Design an enzyme around this catalytic site. Sequence first.
Site, mmCIF file in Angstrom:
data_model
loop_
_atom_site.group_PDB
_atom_site.id
_atom_site.type_symbol
_atom_site.label_atom_id
_atom_site.label_comp_id
_atom_site.label_asym_id
_atom_site.label_seq_id
_atom_site.Cartn_x
_atom_site.Cartn_y
_atom_site.Cartn_z
ATOM 1 N N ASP A 57 -52.060 14.060 -66.134
ATOM 2 C CA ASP A 57 -50.906 14.905 -66.396
ATOM 3 C C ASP A 57 -50.129 14.421 -67.616
ATOM 4 O OD1 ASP A 57 -48.810 16.610 -66.325
ATOM 5 O OD2 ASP A 57 -47.845 15.769 -64.522
ATOM 6 N N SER A 67 -45.449 24.878 -82.509
ATOM 7 C CA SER A 67 -46.480 25.791 -82.975
ATOM 8 C C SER A 67 -45.917 26.669 -84.085
ATOM 9 C CB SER A 67 -46.966 26.657 -81.810
ATOM 10 O OG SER A 67 -47.846 27.670 -82.265
#
Length: 330
Positions: free
Chosen positions: A35, A199
């Site tokens: 994770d 992004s």
Amino acid sequence: STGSATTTPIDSLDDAYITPVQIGTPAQTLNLDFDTGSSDLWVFSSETTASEVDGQTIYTPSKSTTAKLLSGATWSISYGDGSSSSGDVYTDTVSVGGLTVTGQAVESAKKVSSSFTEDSTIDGLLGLAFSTLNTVSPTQQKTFFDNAKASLDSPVFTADLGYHAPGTYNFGFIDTTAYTGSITYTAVSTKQGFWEWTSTGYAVGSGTFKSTSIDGIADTGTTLLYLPATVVSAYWAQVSGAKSSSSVGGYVFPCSATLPSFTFGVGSARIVIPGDYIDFGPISTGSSSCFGGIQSSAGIGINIFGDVALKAAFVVFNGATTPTLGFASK
């Protein structure tokens, strides 16, 4: 040193991925959920409330000759999805795919929430976010990657998740045969303890690319892709019959649909998520309404590049003094 381990979807939907981890002496092998969105290595154990264990493999520290109780140490964590677990702490030897850390904090669960009990395939979590998020008290503990870092050939790990198929976590090296083209690296902020990056935009299907900054986290422990409502609306608008369902808790779409791809930007580079990766199957057994793999982040407070996005890429988690993230197509 290096390590390399195969990671395997837990079910036919890729809801999560498990990777075998050796703990203790002699080794006890547990299948853990790696994770990158959290920083505790915790396991089902002999100390877990018996009614809260249903099929998981447990760690029994009393049977490990290298286990030592970390005196006074406790942990307690709550995840974005509302699940939780808590307990005490041992140090022990932990190996992943040939890479060994001695003195690793192994957080033994005394209590787990129902969602963990109900999932017999996940024996615990191995956190790979930054150690500043580790919940051990009163003395915060380091992640497996943090402990291994100095011994690794290069201070990196890579995630290569499969679509409906096994993939690989590598520590300490970049497998240059595992991706196509080049790896584009992008800046990381560790200010919130996550692999947080920005992004450069997105496209839906064969549509034109929209240049826009999308700040979010690279999170192997989240199944789906969570993005701003404007983006998500633009995606599902291209799927006939798709709608946001309040009762289901997200966008659903007719199971008979062919989904468009979704592209996200990493600097000037582009990662293409095939439409099939966005199909998470019937909302309930036998339904012809299917759950979408791209969902709104509104009210999460952060955008999450979870498995839906990450499995479309070869992803480098670069833990150099100034960390960065790398993405390549594959």
